[PDB]
Design a binder for this molecule. Structure first.
Ligand SMILES: NC[C@@H]1O[C@H](O[C@H]2[C@@H](O)[C@H](O[C@@H]3[C@@H](O)[C@H](N)C[C@H](N)[C@H]3O[C@H]3O[C@H](CO)[C@@H](O)[C@H](O)[C@H]3N)O[C@@H]2CO)[C@H](N)[C@@H](O)[C@@H]1O
Ligand SMILES: [Mg+2]
Ligand SMILES: [Mg+2]
Ligand SMILES: [Mg+2]
Ligand SMILES: [Mg+2]
Ligand SMILES: [Mg+2]
Ligand SMILES: [Mg+2]
Ligand SMILES: [Mg+2]
Ligand SMILES: [Mg+2]
Ligand SMILES: [Mg+2]
Ligand SMILES: [Mg+2]
Ligand SMILES: [Mg+2]
Ligand SMILES: [Mg+2]
Ligand SMILES: [Mg+2]
Ligand SMILES: [Mg+2]
Ligand SMILES: [Mg+2]
Ligand SMILES: [Mg+2]
Ligand SMILES: [Mg+2]
Ligand SMILES: [Mg+2]
Ligand SMILES: [Mg+2]
Ligand SMILES: [Mg+2]
Ligand SMILES: [Mg+2]
Ligand SMILES: [Mg+2]
Ligand SMILES: [Mg+2]
Ligand SMILES: [Mg+2]
Ligand SMILES: [Mg+2]
Ligand SMILES: [Mg+2]
Ligand SMILES: [Mg+2]
Ligand SMILES: [Mg+2]
Ligand SMILES: [Mg+2]
Ligand SMILES: [Mg+2]
Ligand SMILES: [Mg+2]
Ligand SMILES: [Mg+2]
Ligand SMILES: [Mg+2]
Ligand SMILES: [Mg+2]
Ligand SMILES: [Mg+2]
Ligand SMILES: [Mg+2]
Ligand SMILES: [Mg+2]
Ligand SMILES: [Mg+2]
Ligand SMILES: [Mg+2]
Ligand SMILES: [Mg+2]
Ligand SMILES: [Mg+2]
Ligand SMILES: [Mg+2]
Ligand SMILES: [Mg+2]
Ligand SMILES: [Mg+2]
Ligand SMILES: [Mg+2]
Ligand SMILES: [Mg+2]
Ligand SMILES: [Mg+2]
Ligand SMILES: [Mg+2]
Ligand SMILES: [Mg+2]
Ligand SMILES: [Mg+2]
Ligand SMILES: [Mg+2]
Ligand SMILES: [Mg+2]
Ligand SMILES: [Mg+2]
Ligand SMILES: [Mg+2]
Ligand SMILES: [Mg+2]
Ligand SMILES: [Mg+2]
Ligand SMILES: [Mg+2]
Ligand SMILES: [Mg+2]
Ligand SMILES: [Mg+2]
Ligand SMILES: [Mg+2]
Ligand SMILES: [Mg+2]
Ligand SMILES: [Mg+2]
Ligand SMILES: [Mg+2]
Ligand SMILES: [Mg+2]
Ligand SMILES: [Mg+2]
Ligand SMILES: [Mg+2]
Ligand SMILES: [Mg+2]
Ligand SMILES: [Mg+2]
Ligand SMILES: [Mg+2]
Ligand SMILES: [Mg+2]
Ligand SMILES: [Mg+2]
Ligand SMILES: [Mg+2]
Ligand SMILES: [Mg+2]
Ligand SMILES: [Mg+2]
Ligand SMILES: [Mg+2]
Ligand SMILES: [Mg+2]
Ligand SMILES: [Mg+2]
Ligand SMILES: [Mg+2]
Ligand SMILES: [Mg+2]
Ligand SMILES: [Mg+2]
Ligand SMILES: [Mg+2]
Ligand SMILES: [Mg+2]
Ligand SMILES: [Mg+2]
Ligand SMILES: [Mg+2]
Ligand SMILES: [Mg+2]
Ligand SMILES: [Mg+2]
Ligand SMILES: [Mg+2]
Ligand SMILES: [Mg+2]
Ligand SMILES: [Mg+2]
Lengths: 138, 124
RNA sequence: GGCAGGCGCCGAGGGUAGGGCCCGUGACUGGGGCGAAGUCGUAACAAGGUAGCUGUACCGGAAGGUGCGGCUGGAUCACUUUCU
RNA sequence: UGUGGACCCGCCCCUUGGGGUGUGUCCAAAGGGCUUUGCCCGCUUCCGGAUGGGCCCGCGUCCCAUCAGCUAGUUGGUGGGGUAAUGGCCCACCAAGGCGACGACGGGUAGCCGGUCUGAGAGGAUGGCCGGCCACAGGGGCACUGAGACACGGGCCCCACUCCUACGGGAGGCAGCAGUUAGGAAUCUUCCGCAAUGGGCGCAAGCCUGACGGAGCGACGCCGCUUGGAGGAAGAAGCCCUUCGGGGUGUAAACUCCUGAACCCGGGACGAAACCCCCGACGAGGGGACUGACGGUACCGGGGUAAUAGCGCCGGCCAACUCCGUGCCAGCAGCCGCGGUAAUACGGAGGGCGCGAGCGUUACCCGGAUUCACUGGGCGUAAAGGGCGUGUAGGCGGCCUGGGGCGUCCCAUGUGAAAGACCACGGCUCAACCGUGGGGGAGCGUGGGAUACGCUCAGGCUAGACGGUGGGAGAGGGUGGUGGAAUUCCCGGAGUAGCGGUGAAAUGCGCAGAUACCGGGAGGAACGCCGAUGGCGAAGGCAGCCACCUGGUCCACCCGUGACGCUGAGGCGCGAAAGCGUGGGGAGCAAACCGGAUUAGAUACCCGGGUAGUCCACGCCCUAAACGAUGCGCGCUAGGUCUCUGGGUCUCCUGGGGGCCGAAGCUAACGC
């Protein structure tokens, strides 16, 4: 049993990107889904999809990297350089609309669950809500 | 440690050990010389260092050092002390203030006079 | 009916019997830490000249030795000669 | 007298003792003064307000667990007492409760706060002026008076201390202002005034006020200010260097001119206009009079003198180098370090650096120190993984739906006094200081709203976990039994001069016949080969063979249950060796010990003996280099290869386990 499934996904992703996979399966959940939707909108992932690895439902996430580079070590630049869980179980982290993080001076997002749904830092600022700071990505 | 651990125990604030129990907190303490002695220094230093076992108003018998060219202290000299490691003499942790009570200002000094407590020499 | 007065409970503190706690002093005695050039050896570092460390147990001026078991944090295809 | 109010009973609304109501009872009062029938000051009762308070509650408030149990008015109930009022506040009777690992009980320390210092912040430290609350008045109790006290300059009593005393008996209480003394490194005048502001009484005149407004002392702090300004040599003298040519102090000085702190002279404040009195009405309004401690101070004007500079530092950190002196001395030193005859580190000098009416020292707090890490650290070898398990509380918890809305989020609102902090304008010539305004603020209360996540309740699911069926490998554990090799001992045979041991030897054993060899017996302990590069176990640890009794595990099927999970303080159990107890056993081996050697010595290493012990049962002990020096669980992230053990279509696939090399990556490196 996975202790935190949001973090297992943020990670699965991070591990995949770091070896430049094409895509990767994370087991399905509306919430995980709700998050990836945002990753797509902001362009951190090409897309997601509801594949079905042997009977049980997964989310094929498709990754997006940079172009090839010149020099020793061509490996392209990650589009997701950094993706970290802010609120973890046994240390939940809620912020009010007044103290929602400015991530990398905004060259990056923070994803927070609110009573108005899963939103980005700029999305919650407009709507005027806080919630549970789930992760920053930049 | 886990957050929950830091919840159950906590962190632990630190504690300062005074390098000078001149009690009362006080910046100086008065005492009476009971021994004017001489002490051999250590490690890579040889000489003959001036020292005074001093019985303090704080009810403490501590050995204090006697800075300066030369002194005038005797086994009943009332003296005022002030804290300061003498690096060489281990276990000597305070200095005797020079120019207060029985201990006299270093004679014929021109340079660093406030330490050593010797008045401005006159001139006209 | 009041007052004075009287008795009683409670009651500060005191006494006696026994306890627990903290501070001072202390004849004796235990080891510690410091301090250029005092004494004995030479245990450890090189296979430190008996590989070392180790828990335990006895023994020894002293480091230490030996028993039992453990560890590698042991040198190399073949010996015993303290110190500075 | 009853406006009204209190109380008992009843009814009404309300909802705790709130408000109404009807009988019955009960409860009022004070007089004074006048420019005397008409007002002023008082009095009585009731309702309301304002201010000030009591009590109760939620949450917050340091260290020690080397304090783990605590409680008998204790915990609750009924009735009473008490109070302004609730209440074990107190009392009687009854019940047997109450509190604690979310730290009771105990011990230590401490007034709390607004604030203060520091810090990028989060934090850390502090509670000194000022303001708020609390508590105290020589130490301990206690009530009385009263709206209020358990009462600093009221009372009573006991205690300790001082002073009077005619011996019986009395008098005191500066933690009020000054002041003395003691202690200490250290902390002020026995000052002026009630002019202002404030308080008590008074109708007022006024009285009282060590509150207070001022002054005094101390560089204790902050701010402001002076010790001059402009000219002035290729550049005095003295002092110091030097390559003997010079270079430095140095425009510094002298000197020229200019301004004019100090000092003198004259003017001289603001703070003060009310109370009072007159007109009007004793109201609104207008008129008048009095009053200044600070103080002849501040400020203004005239006159006018070139008029205090110290202190620390100069090896690096760290701004500033040269001579002499000293010789591991004398000494310096925050840390590193300087000094042993050429010292930029000691002492002086010249020179230089930094601050400057101050400059240093010591002490303490925060900082740097992500050096207790929430922000923001670590544990293979640097300090750090518990010896291993089982499991309690606790923490944490897969996928789908619905309810609630506890956490969380949002809006509105109340609160967050003043001072301080921020910003602006303003007052003292500036600032320090001060005035007015503005702004911000964590937290908590109330009304409303959201539901993604977390919580909760109600269903559902099968991917986690567990079970069924069928197979498998294993030194996993316990009890019994049994096998051979060897050592020692005993009995017999044969046999004779040594054996044994070491570098070499010697103790030692052997003519009571050893050693070597054959045959028989006893016993105790260990299990060669197989066997390791292997297996099993949670760890310790497990190895001849057989049987019995037991534990874990792995594969296939995809059958059952339906989140039943993970970890785990404490608890419980296990736990090499040595060690301990009782009993047994005792071959070999062997601490101590007894000898022989070796050595300078030899309490050692080498040799010959040898007890405990090593063995078995039962009961303790609880340690370790208990090691992978690497907690357990789950997910993710190239591959190659060797090996143990399952399964399937078996050149190859697919599990579980044990090694090696290596992708990414990590690491202080080693390495992983
Ligand atoms: N501080 C030393 C500690 O005490 C012991 O060491 C202590 C003694 O054993 C040692 O003695 C030594 C001696 O071994 C050596 N051979 C001679 C030397 N003079 C001595 O030294 C001692 O004494 C002299 C005066 O006599 C002092 O000047 C010196 O400072 C001091 N260390 O001096 C030490 C005390 O200063 C422990 N063995 C040692 O492990 C431990 O570190
Ligand atoms: Mg000096
Ligand atoms: Mg009476
Ligand atoms: Mg040696
Ligand atoms: Mg070695
Ligand atoms: Mg002994
Ligand atoms: Mg030892
Ligand atoms: Mg021995
Ligand atoms: Mg050994
Ligand atoms: Mg080590
Ligand atoms: Mg009536
Ligand atoms: Mg009622
Ligand atoms: Mg009524
Ligand atoms: Mg009535
Ligand atoms: Mg009457
Ligand atoms: Mg009258
Ligand atoms: Mg009120
Ligand atoms: Mg009772
Ligand atoms: Mg009662
Ligand atoms: Mg009980
Ligand atoms: Mg106190
Ligand atoms: Mg910090
Ligand atoms: Mg105060
Ligand atoms: Mg007193
Ligand atoms: Mg008094
Ligand atoms: Mg008096
Ligand atoms: Mg004194
Ligand atoms: Mg007055
Ligand atoms: Mg007044
Ligand atoms: Mg000039
Ligand atoms: Mg002039
Ligand atoms: Mg003038
Ligand atoms: Mg007046
Ligand atoms: Mg009139
Ligand atoms: Mg008027
Ligand atoms: Mg001049
Ligand atoms: Mg420099
Ligand atoms: Mg000398
Ligand atoms: Mg210092
Ligand atoms: Mg010299
Ligand atoms: Mg030299
Ligand atoms: Mg010098
Ligand atoms: Mg220096
Ligand atoms: Mg810190
Ligand atoms: Mg660290
Ligand atoms: Mg270590
Ligand atoms: Mg371990
Ligand atoms: Mg350990
Ligand atoms: Mg549990
Ligand atoms: Mg969940
Ligand atoms: Mg739960
Ligand atoms: Mg819901
Ligand atoms: Mg809520
Ligand atoms: Mg305020
Ligand atoms: Mg501040
Ligand atoms: Mg101004
Ligand atoms: Mg609110
Ligand atoms: Mg609300
Ligand atoms: Mg809803
Ligand atoms: Mg369910
Ligand atoms: Mg089976
Ligand atoms: Mg077995
Ligand atoms: Mg025979
Ligand atoms: Mg013989
Ligand atoms: Mg014979
Ligand atoms: Mg034999
Ligand atoms: Mg035989
Ligand atoms: Mg026998
Ligand atoms: Mg294993
Ligand atoms: Mg082992
Ligand atoms: Mg089995
Ligand atoms: Mg099934
Ligand atoms: Mg079902
Ligand atoms: Mg467990
Ligand atoms: Mg054991
Ligand atoms: Mg044993
Ligand atoms: Mg035994
Ligand atoms: Mg025995
Ligand atoms: Mg026996
Ligand atoms: Mg032997
Ligand atoms: Mg033997
Ligand atoms: Mg046993
Ligand atoms: Mg243990
Ligand atoms: Mg893992
Ligand atoms: Mg096969
Ligand atoms: Mg494998
Ligand atoms: Mg293994
Ligand atoms: Mg690499
Ligand atoms: Mg690391
Ligand atoms: Mg590397």
């Amino acid at each position: 049993m996975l202790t935190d499934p949001i973090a297992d996904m943020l990670t699965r992703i991070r591990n995949a990107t770091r070896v430049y996979k094409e895509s990767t399966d994370v087991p399905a959940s509306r919430f995980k889904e709700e998050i990836l939707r945002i990753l797509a909108r902001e362009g951190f992932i090409k897309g997601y999809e509801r594949v079905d690895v042997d009977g049980k439902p997964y989310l094929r996430v498709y990754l997006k990297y940079g172009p090839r580079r010149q020099g020793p070590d061509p490996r392209p630049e990650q589009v997701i350089h950094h993706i970290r869980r802010i609120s973890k179980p046994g240390r939940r982290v809620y912020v009010g609309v007044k103290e929602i993080p400015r991530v990398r001076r905004g060259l990056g997002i923070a994803i927070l669950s609110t009573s108005k749904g899963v939103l980005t830092d700029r999305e919650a600022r407009k709507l005027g809500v806080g919630g549970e700071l789930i992760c920053e990505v930049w | 440690p886990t957050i929950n651990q830091l919840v159950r125990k906590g962190r632990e604030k630190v504690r300062k050990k005074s390098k000078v129990p001149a009690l009362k907190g006080a910046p100086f303490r008065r005492g009476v010389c009971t021994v004017v002695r001489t002490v051999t220094p250590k490690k890579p230093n040889s000489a003959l260092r001036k020292v005074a076992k001093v019985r303090l108003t704080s009810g403490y018998e501590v050995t204090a050092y006697i800075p300066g060219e030369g002194h005038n202290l005797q086994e009943h000299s009332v003296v005022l002390i002030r804290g300061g490691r003498v690096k060489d003499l281990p276990g000597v942790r305070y200095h005797i203030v020079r120019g207060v009570y029985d201990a006299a200002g270093v004679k014929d000094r021109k340079k660093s006079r406030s330490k050593y407590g010797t008045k401005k020499p006159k001139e006209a």
